[PDB]
Design a protein around this ligand. Sequence first.
Ligand SMILES: [Mg+2]
Ligand SMILES: [Mg+2]
Lengths: 215, 215
Amino acid sequence: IMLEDYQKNFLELAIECQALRFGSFKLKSGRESPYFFNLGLFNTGKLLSNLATAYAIAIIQSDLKFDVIFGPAYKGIPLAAIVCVKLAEIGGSKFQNIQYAFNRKEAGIIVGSALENKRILIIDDVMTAINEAFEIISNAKGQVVGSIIALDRQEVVSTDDKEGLSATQTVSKKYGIPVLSIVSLIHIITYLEGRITAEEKSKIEQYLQTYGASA
Amino acid sequence: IMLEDYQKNFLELAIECQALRFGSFKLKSGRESPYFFNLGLFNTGKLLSNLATAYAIAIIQSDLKFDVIFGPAYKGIPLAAIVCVKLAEIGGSKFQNIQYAFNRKEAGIIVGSALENKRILIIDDVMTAINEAFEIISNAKGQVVGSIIALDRQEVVSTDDKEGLSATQTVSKKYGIPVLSIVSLIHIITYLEGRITAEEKSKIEQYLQTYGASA
Ligand SMILES: [Mg+2]
Ligand SMILES: [Mg+2]
């Protein structure tokens, strides 16, 4: 009803491959969470194919205009790559010539074409690092025009500031750009209706209440 | 006649995107070469799509049996990824559950599933580094069963040993495994017939004579 078909498909695969788990989980903060998410578990050719398609459709539907998809080392490298491919495969003539690029985290160089006057989309797995990418890109004269992750957790950044912004909202405000996501926690909650009873369904909604950011 | 359709298609794209150039080029050794090759120039979604397909068909046709495709950091990360995807998309039911993996070059950890008792294919751009990958994989109890690159240059490793082995042959002998390639220099030479006259066509064949390894 609210959920697109690519979002429903992503979430069912997410649950099947165990990238999305439900139960009792303690976050790094110590806060207790009704689910756990690891995109890494999208780890086969089939799963990666579907993951790439799900990112690709979110990007096409967003209407965002860009020249280069950029994935921060290390998790963003394979993601940038498979999604660049997918865009060209299902996106039509406009997405044929989209370049991809990423960075060596040397102990900084960019692997790809010159970013000067190029509009850049950042792709990564999650958003929790962000400034690093913007720095690298702006140094190369690249203009970041957007960001996409798989799951927007929609959690307020500060505990004792319930009316504060989420991670994605914070980034979107600072750089003036959209931060897309395949799904958000509200989407998880929506998909779970009729798959669970008002038991765990409640738990998660009551977690969105306590820790979730407003639209 | 000798060249498969995926090889013809790869080479035409290679020439179109300038990843394959002809002219006078000095190698690192100082040796003079009739062509230059950079896989990096396969840099758009369309080009990456076709590159992935070309690797994927070479792998399917080879009949090699493996569980994991592994790409050495950094150039092998996106390659491992898009090709893992492609295998699942065109390879049928047998390639659905192939995992992919790579390595952080930390100043070593593997990003992916446990490699123990898993049969591994290495994918990289060229072969000139090789031991690094084998070490990493054997430590994790992974069994390397093969390697694939885009272009086999077929050059003898030692100048003053004309009957010596090529780079790929050397690796194949040391580890007892096949080292596949989308194309070799003999394939380049074959494709160029009727596209050039006996002028540069000669030059390259006379370079294969001087510097090429025997079958
Ligand atoms: Mg639309
Ligand atoms: Mg066959």
